[PDB]
Structure formats: structure tokens, C-alpha cells
Amino acid sequence: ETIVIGLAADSGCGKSTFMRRLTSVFGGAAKPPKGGNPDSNTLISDTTTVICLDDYHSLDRYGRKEQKVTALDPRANDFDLMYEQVKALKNGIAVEKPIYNHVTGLLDPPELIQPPKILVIEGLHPMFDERVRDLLDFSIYLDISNEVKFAWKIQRDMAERGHSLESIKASIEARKPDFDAFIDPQKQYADAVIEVLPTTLIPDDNEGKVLRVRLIMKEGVKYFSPVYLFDEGSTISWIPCGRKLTCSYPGIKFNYEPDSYFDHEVSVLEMDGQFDRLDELIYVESHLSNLSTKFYGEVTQQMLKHADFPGSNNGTGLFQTIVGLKIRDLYEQLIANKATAR
Amino acid sequence: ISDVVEKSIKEAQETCAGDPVSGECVAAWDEVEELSAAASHARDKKKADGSDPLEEYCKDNPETNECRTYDN
Amino acid sequence: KLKVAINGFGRIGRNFLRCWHGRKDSPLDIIAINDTGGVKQASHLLKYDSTLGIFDADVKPSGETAISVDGKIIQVVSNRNPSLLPWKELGIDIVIEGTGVFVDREGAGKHIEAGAKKVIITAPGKGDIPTYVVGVNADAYSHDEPIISNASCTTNCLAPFVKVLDQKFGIIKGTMTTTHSYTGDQRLLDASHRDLRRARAAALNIVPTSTGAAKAVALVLPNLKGKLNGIALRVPTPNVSVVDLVVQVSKKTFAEEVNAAFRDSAEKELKGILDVCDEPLVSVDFRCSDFSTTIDSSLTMVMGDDMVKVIAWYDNEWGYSQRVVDLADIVANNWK
Amino acid sequence: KLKVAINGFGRIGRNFLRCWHGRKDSPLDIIAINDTGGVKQASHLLKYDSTLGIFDADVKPSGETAISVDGKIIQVVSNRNPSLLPWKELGIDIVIEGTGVFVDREGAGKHIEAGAKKVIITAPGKGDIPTYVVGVNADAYSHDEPIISNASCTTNCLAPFVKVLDQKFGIIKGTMTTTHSYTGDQRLLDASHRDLRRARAAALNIVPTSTGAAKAVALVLPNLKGKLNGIALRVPTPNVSVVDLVVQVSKKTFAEEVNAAFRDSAEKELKGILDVCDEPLVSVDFRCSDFSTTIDSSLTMVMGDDMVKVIAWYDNEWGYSQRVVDLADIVANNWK
Amino acid sequence: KLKVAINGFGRIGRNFLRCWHGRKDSPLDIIAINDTGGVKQASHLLKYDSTLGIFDADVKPSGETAISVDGKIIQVVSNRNPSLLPWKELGIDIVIEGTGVFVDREGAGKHIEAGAKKVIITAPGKGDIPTYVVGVNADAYSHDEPIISNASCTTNCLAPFVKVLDQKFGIIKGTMTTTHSYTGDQRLLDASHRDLRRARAAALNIVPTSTGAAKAVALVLPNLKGKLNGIALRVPTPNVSVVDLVVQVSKKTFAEEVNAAFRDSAEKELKGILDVCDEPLVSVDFRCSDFSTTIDSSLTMVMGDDMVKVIAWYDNEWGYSQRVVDLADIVANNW
Numbered sequence A: 001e002t003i004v005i006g007l008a009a010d011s012g013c014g015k016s017t018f019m020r021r022l023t024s025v026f027g028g029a030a031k032p033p034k035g036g037n038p039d040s041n042t043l044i045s046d047t048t049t050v051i052c053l054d055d056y057h058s059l060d061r062y063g064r065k066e067q068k069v070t071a072l073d074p075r076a077n078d079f080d081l082m083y084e085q086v087k088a089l090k091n092g093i094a095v096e097k098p099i100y101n102h103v104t105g106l107l108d109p110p111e112l113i114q115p116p117k118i119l120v121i122e123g124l125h126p127m128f129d130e131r132v133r134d135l136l137d138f139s140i141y142l143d144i145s146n147e148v149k150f151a152w153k154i155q156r157d158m159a160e161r162g163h164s165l166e167s168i169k170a171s172i173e174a175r176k177p178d179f180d181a182f183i184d185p186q187k188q189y190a191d192a193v194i195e196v197l198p199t200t201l202i203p204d205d206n207e208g209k210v211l212r213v214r215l216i217m218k219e220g221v222k223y224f225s226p227v228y229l230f231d232e233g234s235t236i237s238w239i240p241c242g243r244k245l246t247c248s249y250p251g252i253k254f255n256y257e258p259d260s261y262f263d264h265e266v267s268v269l270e271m272d273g274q275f276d277r278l279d280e281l282i283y284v285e286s287h288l289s290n291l292s293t294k295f296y297g298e299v300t301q302q303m304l305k306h307a308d309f310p311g312s313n314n315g316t317g318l319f320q321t322i323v324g325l326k327i328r329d330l331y332e333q334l335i336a337n338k339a340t341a342r
Numbered sequence B: 001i002s003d004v005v006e007k008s009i010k011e012a013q014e015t016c017a018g019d020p021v022s023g024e025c026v027a028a029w030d031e032v033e034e035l036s037a038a039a040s041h042a043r044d045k046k047k048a049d050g051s052d053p054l055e056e057y058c059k060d061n062p063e064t065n066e067c068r069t070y071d072n
Numbered sequence C, D: 001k002l003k004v005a006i007n008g009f010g011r012i013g014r015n016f017l018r019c020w021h022g023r024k025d026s027p028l029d030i031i032a033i034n035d036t037g038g039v040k041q042a043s044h045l046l047k048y049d050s051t052l053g054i055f056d057a058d059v060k061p062s063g064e065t066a067i068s069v070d071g072k073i074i075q076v077v078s079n080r081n082p083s084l085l086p087w088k089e090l091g092i093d094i095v096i097e098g099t100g101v102f103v104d105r106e107g108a109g110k111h112i113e114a115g116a117k118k119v120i121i122t123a124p125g126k127g128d129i130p131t132y133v134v135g136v137n138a139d140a141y142s143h144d145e146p147i148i149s150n151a152s153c154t155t156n157c158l159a160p161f162v163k164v165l166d167q168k169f170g171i172i173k174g175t176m177t178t179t180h181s182y183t184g185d186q187r188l189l190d191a192s193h194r195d196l197r198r199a200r201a202a203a204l205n206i207v208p209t210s211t212g213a214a215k216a217v218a219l220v221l222p223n224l225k226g227k228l229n230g231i232a233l234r235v236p237t238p239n240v241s242v243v244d245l246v247v248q249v250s251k252k253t254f255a256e257e258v259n260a261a262f263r264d265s266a267e268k269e270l271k272g273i274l275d276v277c278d279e280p281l282v283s284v285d286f287r288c289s290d291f292s293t294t295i296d297s298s299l300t301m302v303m304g305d306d307m308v309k310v311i312a313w314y315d316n317e318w319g320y321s322q323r324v325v326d327l328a329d330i331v332a333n334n335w336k
Numbered sequence E: 001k002l003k004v005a006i007n008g009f010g011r012i013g014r015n016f017l018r019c020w021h022g023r024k025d026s027p028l029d030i031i032a033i034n035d036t037g038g039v040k041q042a043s044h045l046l047k048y049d050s051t052l053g054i055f056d057a058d059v060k061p062s063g064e065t066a067i068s069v070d071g072k073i074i075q076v077v078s079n080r081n082p083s084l085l086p087w088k089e090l091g092i093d094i095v096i097e098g099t100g101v102f103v104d105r106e107g108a109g110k111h112i113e114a115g116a117k118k119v120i121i122t123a124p125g126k127g128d129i130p131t132y133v134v135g136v137n138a139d140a141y142s143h144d145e146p147i148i149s150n151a152s153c154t155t156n157c158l159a160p161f162v163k164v165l166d167q168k169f170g171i172i173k174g175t176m177t178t179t180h181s182y183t184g185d186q187r188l189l190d191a192s193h194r195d196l197r198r199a200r201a202a203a204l205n206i207v208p209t210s211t212g213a214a215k216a217v218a219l220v221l222p223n224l225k226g227k228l229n230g231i232a233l234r235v236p237t238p239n240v241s242v243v244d245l246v247v248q249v250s251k252k253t254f255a256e257e258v259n260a261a262f263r264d265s266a267e268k269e270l271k272g273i274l275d276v277c278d279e280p281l282v283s284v285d286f287r288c289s290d291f292s293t294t295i296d297s298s299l300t301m302v303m304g305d306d307m308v309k310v311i312a313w314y315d316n317e318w319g320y321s322q323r324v325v326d327l328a329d330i331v332a333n334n335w
Ligand SMILES: NC(=O)c1ccc[n+]([C@@H]2O[C@H](COP(=O)([O-])OP(=O)(O)OC[C@H]3O[C@@H](n4cnc5c(N)ncnc54)[C@H](O)[C@@H]3O)[C@@H](O)[C@H]2O)c1
Pocket: B063, B069, B070, B071, B072, C007, C008, C009, C010, C011, C012, C013, C034, C035, C036, C037, C079, C080, C081, C098, C099, C100, C101, C122, C123, C151, C152, C153, C154, C183, C184, C185, C316, C317, C320, E191, E192
């Protein structure tokens, strides 16, 4: 009776703060399992357990050096074992999961994990394999543009002693051909996809502090109603600043409009700028509709709770918790209808 | 940690000297990318413990006077 | 004839021994105690207590392994790690986990690894641990579950009269405050603690604290999920705690109707679990009251017509310790 | 400048003199004291306060009918009956009623017939008495009224942060309970008392008491008439106290927005009257607080969409005594 | 400019810092604090205190390893093992031992083993260790002693008004009973503890406990070897305590002559250590008193002609901390 959620990521396994918002949305907290391997990429919550797709790796770190395959390459991952354990986890059967330690790089003795209330599979190939794609009850993939990704790499990963500035550009240029063919075309399968881009308000500075973000939601998905701005189906450009709400530079901008996303029908939600304070954070959330919120300001309370985390005031985290609440509403409707048939 | 990052990134730079474009470069750069992310999570966990050592101490010893948290 | 053990010989563990001893016709035979202090202390602190007085029983040690109460021998084994306990050697059936750390499934299961048939957690269980409170969902218990949790003394007091309020009146949303006695977690003088509020001196201060009590009532009554939340006030009294809960009901009512609803509910369905007091009383009067919740008839008042405030007294140690004995009696009633 | 006398050298009377002493260019000049204890006790108890510590001033008796506080000499008289008091001779313009005995207009008007111009009392008056709260109702004072009241320690703490909620949000109905420190009216050990819950030992009990504070704030804010109700809970702490308030507002809101409204109002127009506390704190940290109310931001909590709970701290002895000084300065400013 | 640091940030650790902060010109500089405590945890306990009130300074954290106190920054290291502490790296001269678990030469040597040049134990040391009381045993100190112990709270009170009593009247025999305030030693409610008396609830009742302070005065006053012994009674008050000494003096005297001796001794010899009080006070009025002992003049009785009963108060938290600050000044001036 468990629920499978797929999320693709490039930066790291659990490195994204996306997971911290989702666990907190539907759990008190999430933590690594007690005892066992100190490098276990698994996270355990009351209802949530995060699963690392890096663990289902056919080759150790030593093995891939003697081959042409990258970590993103399909041959390095074995989907045959991954699908077996997930299908066993779906029905409620205990599993044995190997561990890919990022430090040592050698496959460790397998850890066992019990079936969760909600299962999420973080990694790089949730929707790449067609067999696993059916098991997924929800598909998420956040697209990080090369300009903002390179920006994020410099602002956070340049401080390491060994790295040089142009050496970092040499890293993502090597990762681009493998990522473009094997990771990027997963955008069509994703039920909801978040793009991040440099802002158009300020003169295009690539620090990544204030970015431009679009939320693309597939329409027609069961137990899923897309968030809309003032009207479902129309095209709106709204700037919230004015007579009653006054805020400083750079500002805030929104764009709700329908779109065609790889022969699908979607409605996009764009946000460009950042939140200077609380007053426009409620003002923005108040006017949005189909939020799947239990009470007034639930989105604001979850963001202010996690404000110190990176990207909690620029709209990235705002759409992350909005998507996070949607998984909950998807979860509660689905288990209720399953219970009637059960 | 960072010393093994420096060794990996030096050898990855030297491995690309033999081949401008090859599959050995993408092998060398993939490792360096994984090591840098590995150092980042170790850096975050070191910083996270320094502000609150007791919650890590209360992780192993919850019966001591500093660590007891009874409700009601 | 169930062999019951006590793993935490703290405030609740000693009351559980005092409550089991005072009872007649109980299927529990206490044969095992696990205090880190040893036999010398467990013999002494059980005999003399500051809040309950001297035990009316010839409590004296019998060797360096066991103690004797009124002729009955109880074994004292001191071991911090519960997995190494000789539970299988003694053959104990239930474990009264009163330590207060092993509130998770993994920690309490170390008793099951030692040969315990069942474990009762005196704290509200962490994670997907089935929480049963006596008087509300007591019949929901089945023998299949190996680990069960009896909820908080706040919840054990909050759940019964909330059950009366939800059913007869119809509740929409409620806020709770509990003025609680200080507990062992608080420091006596200011020193380091995980919670900075608890770290301050308990005897001199009103310490606010976080409790999941109002959120834990959702576990025993599924209707109230997302309808309640609460805080706690730790006042310089040692034993007696009082909780006040203000709700927004659906049925327009007045004050004395709420009291009359707690009297027929007392005699009919909650006899021995819930009581109502109509005399001007203070905290010390409610010492050693077996009723898990005791309403104060004078103080309840409804503002508007559907916002009801009702406050109730309860004994945090003794009143809750009895409910653990009642719960273990229910466990002993349904065996195999 | 203005001749002011004190009738009743109690906790409020002693705190008044020390709060007035610390002020700068305060128009009032204290000339007389009326305490039945005598000069030896008033001089000693002024210097040595158990709650507030010693007085950072030289206090020595001058002659045998007066005391000298930091050079300034203050006549001290002792009499139960205010009609015999020499307010004619000393020509006192403002007499302060700290006894707590004369709260009716008939009884507390004896100072006027003794020769006093205006009397302000430190308790909620009985009958028709104008009741003011600094920062809420003190801006509508007419000099013609010769008997005034500064409302109680809770009512002075309630009205400022209650006024903001009604203005910004709008309240339908609300309730409160104040976990108050104990006071002089309670008995130290159990002995005869007309209010039986006050007869009990204050040091060992949680004494619950009916209060007029929630009903008295309707005299301060007219649109809140018949919408608030409250009862008090007295716990064994000497000085500091808390009050939590639950109200059903009309405008939908959540927790943090209420704090943002309180913080903005605390800086805008309730400066020096309201402060918002963002740190995890405890009662003694609010000893000798100059604000009428200090909201605890961590405990503010809403349920549903329109039920708001707010916890506030107040120093009943000192913080209320500061407002009595500030109200007396208000009278002296437009004194004509 | 002597670099000192604290090993325990409890009651005596915090009171030491605030006593050092009150000094107008001191040769001590605090750099590090060792405790089982975080930066936000140690700073919040320093600023706000349930006993002495709010610290009158600007206390805030500077980084995740240090705090800011009135513009001065001190690092906060957190390691329970002293032998693994970074003392040589910061340049520590002496270390205040306030943990209470290192009072033996084997244990307290883990600081000098780690880079300390001296340590000051805030407890009666176990075994052969120097025991010094300010105003009585302050002179007999040399730079040679690497480990020194300031005596217990009631010893720093008992030695001053006995040293004057022994020299001017002669002490044949005597006993002592100090009604002490409850400390962090006892338990809030009845819990597990090895001392069956202290294991019981501290806030509720009186607790008799043994004390070595009556014997410990022979360490500073060798003229009293085997003539004083006594016990202590823990009472439910937070901070300040009182002592009661009844000795059988040799020279015949009356009661007023006893108070006359303390008045004259306080004016010249024990100025700053001993004081006499004549007004009818209670415990709370002696908070933050810098004198190690304030004799209650109106309570001094004499029975027969040679039995003298004297009562004196002391702030064990504050007054004893000031003696540690004053004794630490003696270490600096003799460096
Ligand atoms: N009034 C109450 O105290 C009350 C009321 C309701 C629920 N509860 C909950 O029930 C539990 C009972 O707590 P308490 O009042 O006994 O606290 P307590 O401070 O009295 O308990 C301390 C005792 O726990 C024992 N202990 C600690 N660690 C141990 C270990 N590793 N192995 C074996 N024994 C160990 C010690 O022997 C000690 O005597 C608490 O966790 C509390 O959350 C308490």
C-alpha cells in the first residue's frame, strides 16, 4: 500500500534541499538510520524514506575507472535489481539494498530497509527505465540551467582547495554530452518539472542569488490539480508590488499561461525575483489557488521554518514546498480510493 | 578529504593531457565531480556539529542530565 | 499469572510497583527490576518517597541481587544496554519500559531480543508505534502487536473528556494549555541542557515547554487530526498538574450543560477514569487520585455560545501509573 | 513639583517609590506615606526588599516621624482611618491607594474629605469609577474626575496587545487564563479565609481564582464589551506571571503574521509599553520589566484559520508600578 | 595580561566570568571556555541567570566557535576529555577547574599534560594538594606549585572568622553546622544517586550531608589539627547559605567582646574578606556579597564564659567565586 515517488537530480543524492521540505511537509523530521553504515545514503522518517539510486550501481568506484562509463551512464546503473527491490517494496516486502559510499567508493554490505508509508527515489534515472516508470505514482525532475548550475558550482564548490575556476567549466563540459542524451529527455515523463534560469529584472548577474524559475505541471494527471493564478486556462502577467504592497529592488514578477510541453498539455507558473520580507510572502501565497493547503499560510509557515536553508527566499524553495503539498494531497486521495477497493 | 580532492584533480588534469577528447577524460572528470560533492557533505556535517555538540552527544547518551527530554 | 518486569525504576516505575502492590486480584507478578543505581538504592527510594510518603510494606534487600517486599522477592539487575538483560532466564512476559529513552521500535525491541513477549512504553511512542490509552480505545488492542505505547499523562487526561466533548457536543477546533508539575528532565540549577527553556531552574521559574500531547490525541481519536495543538507550563509544584482546554464546539451550549454531560458520562462509560469535583480545591488535594482526569466544576465557562473552556486536575505520576496497570491488565486479559 | 502621598506601603507602595526614584525629571515629589506598620518597618522594608533586592540609595530615619531617602525627607504617618489623615496640613494634591481596602468611591473618597485633591487607586474600582490603561485609554482623561483607577496587573497587561488584535484583525469572542504568581492575600499555611481556595498554602499549591481582569478590559475598550472571559491560576512563584489569551478573530491569519503585527505595533505606537521576545526565556528573566506586556513569539499559535492563542509575560509588582507612575505623570501634565 | 581559561562553565564557572567582568583593572584575560555546551547554549546561560539576574553586557555569538562579551571574544571549545583539549594552541597559562570530576592530581594533570602551565581546582583537592584561602593562607604560596586548590564554599567562610578567633581567644575544641542551600549535586525529584540522602528531592525538604570543610581548615590553619568537625544541612533555598560555629574558647570572655574583635579585625586585617552586620537581615539580602563571611552581630551568644556561638552568612556562588578571582590575582602577581 506504499506510494512510490520519483525525483531526478544532478547535484547530489540528498544534497538538494528539495528533500528537506518534502519530509517536513509530511513528517516531523528525517534522519539516517540508527547504527549500520555511517555512509548510508538512506534517510528515514516516520512516513518518508529516501532511497538513493546511486546505491543501485553495478560497478564500484575502482571499476568505472577502467571503463568508459560515467556515473550518469546507463551501463553503470543496473535497473534489473532496482526494479525488483522497488516492486517488492511496493507490495510491502522487506528488501536488501547495497550501499554506494561516496567517500570510499566501494560497494558495502547490503542494508535492509522496511516498507515505508511514502517511498521517494532520489537519483538520476527514476524515469529513464520504462518498467520503473509504471511503478512511479508521481514523477518530478528539476532542470538546472547550465548558466545557473555553473553559478551554483562556483558559489558553493569553488572554495575547495584543489579546484580552479576554469577547471570547473572543464568538468561540466565533459558531463554535458552524457547528461544531455541520457538524463535530459526525462522531462517529458515528469509529472511536474521546475526550471531555474537567470533573472531578467537585474542586468543578468550570474551569482544565482535571485533567479528566474518556472513550474511546469502536466494536466490530466489523476489526483493532481495544477496551481493556477487568478484564472485556470488564461494568460496572466502579474507584478504584486503597488499601492498596498511595497517592496524594494529587484522586485517580484509572475507569469501564468498554458503551454505545450513535448506534445503534452501543461500550465506553467513563473516567478522572477526574490522575497524581501514576510508581507509579500503571504501576499503571493494568498492569491494563488488550488494550493492543496490544510489552513491559511501553510506554505509560508513551511518556508519560514526552513528559511536558513539555501534558496528559501528566491522562489526555488517556494515551488518545492508547493509541489511538496501536492504530493500530500495526491497521497491522501490515492490511499482513500485504494481503501475503498481494498 | 581535500588532500584526496587535490590528488584526484591533479591526476584528472594530467589524464586529459594525453587525450583532448576521449572517454578517459569523462572518466577522470566524473570522479572529481563525485569527490567534490563528497567533500561538500562532509563540510556541511562538520559545520552542523560545531554549533550544537550536545545533540550529537545526546545521540549516544540520552540519560544524562543535559540530554533528558521528557514530555509532560 | 504473568511475569512482568520493570526496566525503568524512576518516578513512574516506583509508582507502578506501589500501584500494583495496592491492587487486589491483578494478573501481574513483578519479578524483575532494572535500576542503574543498584539494589541498595531501589530498596531505599521505594521505601521512602517525598511525594507519596513511606511505603506501608517491609521493603528490605535480600542479597546483592534481589529485594524483598512483604515476603515477595523481586530481582534487581543493573544493565544500561537492555539487550544483555536475562529476560529469557527469568521468563518475563511483559516489560514496563519506564526509562524514557527507548521510545522507538528499534530501541524497545532490544527487550524482545532478550526474550520479552511484550513491551509497554510509558512514554508516547515515537514513530509507527500503536498508542492505546485506557478509557478511549482500550478495546482496539490485539495481542498481535509486540510493542505498545501508553500515551502522555496530559493525553491520558486530555483524551477522556475530549471524547465526551466530541461525541455529545461536536468539536471543530481547540487549543490546549497544561500547567504541569516539574519533572526529572529539568535541571535543579541553571546548567546546560538540549532545551534552553528546560535548562533554567525548575524550582524558581515558570518554564514553558513543547509537548505533542494535543497532537497525540489524534492517535487515540482519528476525528481530531489537525484540530488541536497545545503548550505546557512547568510550575514549581512537584506532583500535581492541571490542564485547561478551550474548544470551539458545533452545538450551542452553556456552562452547566457541559458539567452535566461530564456527570452522566462519569457514571455510565468512564467510571473510574473520569470524575468531577464541585468543591473549591487546589493541586495538593488531588494527590493519589486514581481518576486519570478530574474536572473542576466551578471553573468551566463558555464564552459566546460555542467556545467552551473546561479545566481539569490530574495526578501526573500516580494517576498515569494506574492507567499503565490497567493497560497491562488488559494485556494480561488477552493472552495468546 | 506636585505634592503626592502614598496610602498603603505594600508591594505596590514599595515598588512605586523605587520606580519613581529611578525616573528623571518626574513632576511628582513624594511627601507622605500612610502605613500602619510604622517608621521602623517602612524604613527597613523599603531598603531591604526580598523580591527586588536592596535599595541603591541611602535610607535612614529622619527624626522619628519621617525617613530620609537620598537626602530627600519623607513624612511617614500611620492611621487606619483616612478621614483623620493630615492631607490638609501637608496639602497633598494626589493620594495613591495601595492598601487595597478602599476601592469603592464612598470609601476611597475619604481622602478628598481629608483634604486631598485627587485620589488614584491601584485596583479595579467598584461602582462607577473611571478606569484607565496607559497606552490604551490614558489619552481620554478629563481632569474633572477626581477618583481614578489603574486597572489590575493582568488588565494592564491584557489591554495593549488585545487592542492591537481588535484593530488589526477584529475579535469575535475570547477567553484567557493567567498563570499568576502568588500575592499577599493568600494564606501561607491553611487557615480560615472567606475564599477557601485562597486559604490553602500558596507555596505548595496551584490556587485557581476568579478574576475581574478579562471583564474589566471592557471598561477600557468599549467595542470589546461582553466578549472576553477569564479565570486566574496562582502558582508558587514570587514575582513574575504569565497570561495566555485565546480569541476567535474574524480575518483569517496564521501564527507568524500575528507576531509581525505585534512587532510592528510595538515599535510604532506602543513603544515602551509592548515588546516582543524572540528568545526561549523564563519568568525570572522578566523580573523588573518596564513593559506592560512582553509577548513570547515562540509560543504564539493559531488553529483552524481564525482562533489565535497568544502568551504574554508581565511583572505584576514592578511593571504595573511603572504604569502607575506614568499615569500619575499624565494627571500632573494636564493638571489644571 | 595573563592568559587564563575555564574548564567548567557551571555555577562557579559563570560566576567567575561575571566576577572578573566587574573588576576595574585585572591582569586576567579569558580566551577559551571548555564545557559540554554549544555556543548558543553557553551564551544564553551567561546572559540570563535565574539566581543573579540578567548579565549587564552585550552577549552574542561571534561565529560557531566563539561568543562576544562586551566587545571581547572568547572561543568555546567542547570536549569532555581534558588531555585532548587545545590549550597550547591558544596559549593558556592557567585553567580554572570547575567540572568537579578532576580534583585528583592524576586527573587534573590532564590540562598541563595538554599544554597548561598551572591549574586552579575549585574544590577541596584529593590527596596531597595545596589548599589556600584568601586572607588566611594567601602568603604561603610559590610559583612552584603547578596545581592549587581553593577550598570549599563554607571553608572560605569558616577560616576567616576562626583565624581571628583562634589567635585572640584560643580554640580548644568546637563543632560546626552550616545550613546550606541546595546545589546541582542533589536531585530535583527522588532519583538514582549514590548518596541516599542527596538522592531525595532537593526543593522539598532538608537534607543532611557530610562536609569536610570543618577538617579542611587545618590545611590553612595547622594550629587546629583535630579540634573542629561538623556536618551540613541542605535547605530548599537557591543560593545563599549560613554557618553556625560553637567553639570552646580558652580565655574567658563575654558576647560583646566577640563582636568587638570581628569589628576591629575587619577594619584592618580582613578588609574585603570579613564584615560584621548589625541589622536584622535574611538570606536574600546577602546575594552577590563580596565578603566571604558577614557576621550577624545580634546572634552571637556566649554560654557560661568560654563557649561562643557565632552565625555568619556567605554567598557560596558569588563570594567564593570572588575568592577564586582574588586567588587567581595572586597567581598572576607571583608569575
Ligand atoms: N510524571 C511523569 O514523570 C510522567 C508522566 C507521564 C509520562 N511520563 C513519561 O514516562 C517516562 C517516565 O520517566 P520518569 O518520571 O521515571 O523519569 P525519571 O527521571 O524518574 O527516570 C530516571 C530513571 O531512568 C532509569 N534509566 C535511565 N537510563 C536507563 C538505561 N539506559 N537503562 C535502564 N534504566 C535507565 C534510571 O535508573 C533512573 O532511575 C518519562 O520518559 C516521561 O516522558 C512521565
